[PDB]
Amino acid sequence: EKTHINIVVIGHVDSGKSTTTGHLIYKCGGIDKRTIEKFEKEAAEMGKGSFKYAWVLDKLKAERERGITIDISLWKFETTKYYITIIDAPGHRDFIKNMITGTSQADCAVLIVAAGVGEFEAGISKNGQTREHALLAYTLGVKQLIVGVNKMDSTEPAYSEKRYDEIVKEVSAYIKKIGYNPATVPFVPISGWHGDNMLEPSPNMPWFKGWKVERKEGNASGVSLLEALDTILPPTRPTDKPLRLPLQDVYKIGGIGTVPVGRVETGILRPGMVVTFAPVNITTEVKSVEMHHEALSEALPGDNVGFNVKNVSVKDIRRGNVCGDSKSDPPQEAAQFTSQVIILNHPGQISAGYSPVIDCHTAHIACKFAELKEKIDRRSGKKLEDNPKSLKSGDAAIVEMVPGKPMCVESFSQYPPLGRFAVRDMRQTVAVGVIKNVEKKSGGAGKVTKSAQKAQKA
Amino acid sequence: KTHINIVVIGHVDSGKSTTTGHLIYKCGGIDKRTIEKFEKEAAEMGKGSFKYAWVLDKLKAERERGITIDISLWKFETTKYYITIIDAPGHRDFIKNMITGTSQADCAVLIVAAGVGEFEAGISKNGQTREHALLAYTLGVKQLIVGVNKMDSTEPAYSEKRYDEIVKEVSAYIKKIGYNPATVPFVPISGWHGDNMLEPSPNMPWFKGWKVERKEGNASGVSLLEALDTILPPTRPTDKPLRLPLQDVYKIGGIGTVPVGRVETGILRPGMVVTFAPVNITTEVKSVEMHHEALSEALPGDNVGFNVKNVSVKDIRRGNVCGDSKSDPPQEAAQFTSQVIILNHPGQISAGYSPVIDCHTAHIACKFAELKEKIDRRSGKKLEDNPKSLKSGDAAIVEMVPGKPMCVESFSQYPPLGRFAVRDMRQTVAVGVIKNVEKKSGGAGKVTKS
Numbered sequence: 027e028k029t030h031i032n033i034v035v036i037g038h039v040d041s042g043k044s045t046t047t048g049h050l051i052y053k054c055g056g057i058d059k060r061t062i063e064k065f066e067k068e069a070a071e072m073g074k075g076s077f078k079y080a081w082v083l084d085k086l087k088a089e090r091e092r093g094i095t096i097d098i099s100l101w102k103f104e105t106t107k108y109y110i111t112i113i114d115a116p117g118h119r120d121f122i123k124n125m126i127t128g129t130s131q132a133d134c135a136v137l138i139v140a141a142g143v144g145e146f147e148a149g150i151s152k153n154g155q156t157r158e159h160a161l162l163a164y165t166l167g168v169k170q171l172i173v174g175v176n177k178m179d180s181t182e183p184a185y186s187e188k189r190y191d192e193i194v195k196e197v198s199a200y201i202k203k204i205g206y207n208p209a210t211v212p213f214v215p216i217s218g219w220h221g222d223n224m225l226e227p228s229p230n231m232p233w234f235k236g237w238k239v240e241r242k243e244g245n246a247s248g249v250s251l252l253e254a255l256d257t258i259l260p261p262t263r264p265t266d267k268p269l270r271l272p273l274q275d276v277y278k279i280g281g282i283g284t285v286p287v288g289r290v291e292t293g294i295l296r297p298g299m300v301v302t303f304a305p306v307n308i309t310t311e312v313k314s315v316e317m318h319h320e321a322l323s324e325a326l327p328g329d330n331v332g333f334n335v336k337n338v339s340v341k342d343i344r345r346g347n348v349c350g351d352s353k354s355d356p357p358q359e360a361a362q363f364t365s366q367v368i369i370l371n372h373p374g375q376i377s378a379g380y381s382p383v384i385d386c387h388t389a390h391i392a393c394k395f396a397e398l399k400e401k402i403d404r405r406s407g408k409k410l411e412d413n414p415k416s417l418k419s420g421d422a423a424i425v426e427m428v429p430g431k432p433m434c435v436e437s438f439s440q441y442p443p444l445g446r447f448a449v450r451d452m453r454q455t456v457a458v459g460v461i462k463n464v465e466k467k468s469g470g471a472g473k474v475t476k477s478a479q480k481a482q483k484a
Numbered sequence: 485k486t487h488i489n490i491v492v493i494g495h496v497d498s499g500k501s502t503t504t505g506h507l508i509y510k511c512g513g514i515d516k517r518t519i520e521k522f523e524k525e526a527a528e529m530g531k532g533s534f535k536y537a538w539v540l541d542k543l544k545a546e547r548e549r550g551i552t553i554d555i556s557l558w559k560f561e562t563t564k565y566y567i568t569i570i571d572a573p574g575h576r577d578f579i580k581n582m583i584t585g586t587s588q589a590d591c592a593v594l595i596v597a598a599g600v601g602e603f604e605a606g607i608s609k610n611g612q613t614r615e616h617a618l619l620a621y622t623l624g625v626k627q628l629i630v631g632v633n634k635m636d637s638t639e640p641a642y643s644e645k646r647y648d649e650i651v652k653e654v655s656a657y658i659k660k661i662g663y664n665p666a667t668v669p670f671v672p673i674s675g676w677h678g679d680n681m682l683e684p685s686p687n688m689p690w691f692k693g694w695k696v697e698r699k700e701g702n703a704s705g706v707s708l709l710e711a712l713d714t715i716l717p718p719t720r721p722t723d724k725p726l727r728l729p730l731q732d733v734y735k736i737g738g739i740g741t742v743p744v745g746r747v748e749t750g751i752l753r754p755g756m757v758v759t760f761a762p763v764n765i766t767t768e769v770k771s772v773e774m775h776h777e778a779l780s781e782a783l784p785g786d787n788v789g790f791n792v793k794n795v796s797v798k799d800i801r802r803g804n805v806c807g808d809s810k811s812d813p814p815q816e817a818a819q820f821t822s823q824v825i826i827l828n829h830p831g832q833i834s835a836g837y838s839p840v841i842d843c844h845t846a847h848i849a850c851k852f853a854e855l856k857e858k859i860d861r862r863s864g865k866k867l868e869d870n871p872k873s874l875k876s877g878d879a880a881i882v883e884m885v886p887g888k889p890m891c892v893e894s895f896s897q898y899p900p901l902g903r904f905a906v907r908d909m910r911q912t913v914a915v916g917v918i919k920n921v922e923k924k925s926g927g928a929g930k931v932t933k934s
C-alpha cells in the first residue's frame with residue numbers, strides 16, 4: 027500500500043556505510059531475531075568480518091553482482107510513509123556498472139560522512155570519494171540527497187556541535203557547486219555504531235534541535251535519520267518536464283500525410299502544438315495524434331503514439347530524430363557531449379579516436395571518442411588517472427564524444443530516456459554510459475512550415 | 485490488446501532470423517526507409533544473411549551484457565496481440581537470459597528445416613531441435629508453434645511427404661519431452677519466399693491447415709500468423725494454488741505467532757487452513773493484516789502478516805513455504821532436477837558439490853548429486869551426457885538433493901519458487917531454474933486444534 031523507495035548509500039571508505047546500514051536494518055525490524063543470528067553465525071563461519079552489523083551490507087554487495095536477485099526483503103524496511111530498500115553501495119566489482127546501466131536505480135542517496143579528526147578532511151580532499159560519490163549521484167539524476175554526519179561519538183570532544191557545524195558548512199559548499207541546493211538536503215548527525223539519532227533523538231546531542239529543508243514542494247523538519255528518510259519526495263512524473271519524443275518510425279499514410287511514431291518520454295503532446303524536430307531543425311504544428319488507432323486528446327509520458335504533422339515529407343524526418351515543442355526548451359543538435367562510461371568485456375585497447383556506433387534512445391549514430399578525460403575505478407567510482415592513454419575491459423571513464431552525423435542527445439540528469447547509451451562494435455556491446463553534459467550546436471531558427479508560421483502569428 | 489512475448493528457437497541455420505525478419509517486414513512494424521538503412525548496414529558488416537535476417541541478428545546482439553536501449557524494432561502487431569520477440573539462440577548470453585528471466589517468453593516458435601540439402605534429414609536423438617524444445621519446456625513455455633521451414637528446398641519442392649515425415653518425427657520427441665503434440669500447430673512455411681506466413685501459399689494446395697486441441701478449446705488455421713493468434717494468455721497468479729514463502733516469523737504478545745511474507749500465487753483468507761512446508765504443520769489462519777490493519781484477502785503481490793493458531797515461533801522459520809491445505813499443499817523436496825549456467829569461480833564442479841542455494845526466502849545447502857548434461861550457452865546444444873565436471877561458462881542439467889529440509893517448486897508451475905542462485909561463500913557461482921521436483925514420501929503430520 028505504501029510507496030516504494032530505493033536508497034543507495036555512498037561515502038568515502040571506512041566512513042561507516044556498512045555499520046550504519048546494518049544497524050538501520052537491525053533496528054527497523056524487517057529481519058527477525060533468529061534470522062539475524064543465523065546470518066551473524068554464517069559470516070563468522072566464513073572467518074571474514076565478524077564485526078557487528080557488518081554482514082548486512084557485505085551480503086547486499088555480494089548479491090548485487092552478476093547473476094540474479096532472488097530476494098531483497100532483507101534490505102527492505104518500512105517507515106511511516108515509505109517502503110525503503112537499500113539497493114546498492116560502493117565497494118564491489120559491479121557497482122559502477124549497476125549505477126550506469128540502471129539495474130540499481132536510486133530515488134535518493136544517503137551520503138555518509140565521518141566526523142572524526144582527519145577522517146572528514148580525507149574524504150573531502152582531492153583523494154577522497156565524498157565529492158566523487160556526490161557528483162556521481164547528481165550525474166545519475168538522483169536529485170534527492172541525505173547527508174549523514176557519522177561517527178559523532180568520536181569527535182573531540184565527543185558529540186561536538188562545533189565539529190558538526192564545520193562539516194555542514196564545507197559539505198554544503200561542495201555539493202552546491204555540484205548542482206544540489208544545500209537548503210533541500212538534510213544533515214543528520216548520527217552514530218552508526220551506537221545508534222545515536224538514527225530512529226530517535228540522542229541524549230548525547232541535546233544541542234541538536236533538528237534539521238530543516240526548504241523546497242517549493244513543501245518544507246520539512248525532523249531530528250532523526252529515519253525522519254529524513256520520510257521527507258524523500260516520490261518519483262517526479264515527467265509530465266512536468268518539456269516535451270521529448272524520439273521518433274521510432276516515420277510512415278506515409280494515404281490521405282493523411284506524414285505520421286512519425288514514437289513513445290513520449292517527457293512532457294505532454296497534444297494536437298495543435300508547434301513542435302520542433304532535432305537535429306534536422308524543422309518546426310510544425312501537429313494535426314492529430316492517435317494511440318492504438320484511436321484518437322487521443324493528449325499524450326502523457328509512456329504512450330506509444332503516432333502523430334500527424336503538416337507540410338513535412340517522409341524524407342525530412344527519420345528514426346532517431348527527437349521531437350519537442352518550441353514553447354519549452356526545444357531539442358537542439360548535439361555538437362559534443364562528455365559522458366561517464368563503463369568498458370565491458372572486449373580484449374582490445376580503446377585509444378582516443380576509437381569510433382564506434384552509439385545506440386541512444388531510437389538514434390543509432392557513429393561517434394568519436396575525442397578524449398579520454400578520466401580513468402575511474404569501477405568498484406568505487408574513485409578517480410585513478412588524469413587523461414589516460416587507453417582504456418581496457420573493466421575500466422570506467424569520462425570521455426568527450428563528437429558524433430560523425432547530426433544527433434540529438436540530452437544530459438541524463440535532465441532527460442534520462444535520452445541520456446543513457448550503448449556502445450556497439452559489430453555484434454558486440456563494448457561500453458555503456460550516461461551523458462554528463464552536452465554542448466548544443468549553434469544552429470538557429472530552422473525552416474518553419476506554413477502551418478507553423480500561421481500558429482506563431484496569433 | 486494483450487502484450488505477448490515470443491522466443492524463436494531451432495537448429496542453427498534452420499532459418500530463425502530469416503523467418504522472423506520476414507514476418508516483421510510483412511507486419512509493417514518498421515518503416516521502409518529504416519529497413520533499408522539497416523539492410524545496408526548489415527551487408528557492410530558481412531556476418532549474417534543480407535536480407536530479412538538482420539532483424540533477429542540485431543536483437544541477438546542487443547540482448548547482451550545486460551543493456552537494453554530500444555526494443556521498438558521487434559514489436560509487431562497481429563490481429564489479437566502485440567507480439568515482441570525477446571531472444572533466440574546464437575549468442576553468449578542466451579541461456580543466461582532465459583534462466584534469469586530478463587526474457588520471459590509466452591510461446592516458443594520452433595523452426596525446423598525441411599530442406600536439409602545433403603545433410604542429415606533426421607532430427608537426431610541428441611540434436612539441437614530436441615534440446616531447444618526440452619529447454620522451452622524447462623522454462624515453462626508451454627505453448628509451442630513448429631514452423632517447418634525451407635519447404636521450397638524439399639525433394640520434390642513443397643513435398644507433403646517430407647512435411648509429414650518431420651511432423652511425425654518431431655511429434656514423437658516433444659511428446660516424450662512433455663508437450664501434447666495435439667496442442668502444437670505445425671505450419672509448413674518458406675521464411676525466404678514468404679510461403680504460408682500471412683496467407684495460404686499457392687505452392688502447397690495439399691496443406692488444408694493445422695489444428696490444435698487444447699483443454700481450453702480447439703482452433704484451426706493455415707498461415708503462421710493465425711498460429712500466433714491461438715497463443716493463450718498466461719495463467720494469472722491469482723488462479724493458482726496459494727504459495728507464500730515466509731520472510732519472517734514474529735511473536736507478538738497477546739496475538740501470538742505472526743508469520744510475514746509475500747503472496748506469490750493464490751489468495752490468503754482469514755479462516756483458511758494452511759500447511760507449512762517442509763515442516764508439515766497444518767493450522768487455521770486467525771487473521772491477515774497489512775500495515776497493522778485487517779484484511780479480507782491477501783492477493784498475489786501483497787506483503788502481509790497473518791496470525792496462526794497453535795503454532796510456536798520455534799516451529800516455523802524464514803524459508804518455509806505456506807499454502808492451502810486443501811488445494812495443492814506444498815511439500816518437502818526429496819530431490820529436484822534443474823537447469824543451471826555456471827558463472828566464473830575458482831576450480832571445477834564435480835558431482836557431490838554441496839553449495840548454498842538461494843531460492844525464494846530459503847537459504848539451504850544442496851548437493852549436486854548428478855551431473856546429467858553439459859550444454860553450450862551460446863547455441864543451447866548438448867555437448868556431453870553425464871559430464872565428469874562443469875567449468876565456468878558451462879550450462880548443465882543437474883539433479884540436486886537438499887541437505888536440510890527444503891521446499892521448492894517447478895519453475896513452470898510456480899515461477900517465484902522455481903528459480904535459484906548458487907553461492908559459495910559470498911560469490912555467486914551459478915543460477916538455475918527447477919525442471920521437476922520429487923516430493924517427499926511424508927504424509928500429513930501435525931494438525932493443530934483447528
Ligand SMILES: Nc1nc2c(ncn2[C@@H]2O[C@H](COP(=O)(O)OP(=O)(O)O)[C@@H](O)[C@H]2O)c(=O)[nH]1
Nearest residue numbers: 038039040041042043044045177180217218219
Ligand atoms: N566510533 C565509531 N566508529 C564507527 C562508527 N560507524 C562505523 N565505525 C567504525 O569505523 C569503521 C568503518 O567501518 P564500515 O562501517 O565498514 O565503513 P564503510 O567502509 O564506509 O562501509 C569500522 O571500524 C566501524 O566499526 C561510529 O558511528 N562511531
Ligand SMILES: Nc1nc2c(ncn2[C@@H]2O[C@H](COP(=O)(O)OP(=O)(O)O)[C@@H](O)[C@H]2O)c(=O)[nH]1
Nearest residue numbers: 496497498499500501502533537634674675676
Ligand atoms: N531456401 C531457403 N533458404 C532459407 C529459408 N529460410 C532461411 N534460409 C537461408 O538459410 C540460411 C540460414 O538462415 P538464418 O535465417 O540465418 O538461420 P538461423 O541461423 O536459424 O537464424 C540463410 O542462408 C538463409 O537465407 C527458406 O525458407 N528457404
Ligand SMILES: *NCCOP(=O)(O)OC[C@H](O)CO
Nearest residue numbers: 378379395396397398399426
Ligand atoms: N580530445 C582532444 C585532445 O586535445 P584537447 O585540447 O584537450 O581538445 C580540444 C581540441 O584540441 C580542439 O582542437
Ligand SMILES: *NCCOP(=O)(O)OC[C@H](O)CO
Nearest residue numbers: 722723751753780781782783
Ligand atoms: N478478495 C477479493 C477482492 O479482490 P478481487 O480483485 O475482487 O479478487 C477476486 C478474484 O481474484 C476473482 O477471481
Ligand SMILES: *NCCOP(=O)(O)OC[C@H](O)CO
Nearest residue numbers: 819835836852853854855883
Ligand atoms: N547420482 C549417483 C548415485 O547413483 P544413481 O544410480 O545414479 O541414482 C540412484 C537413483 O536416484 C535411484 O534409482
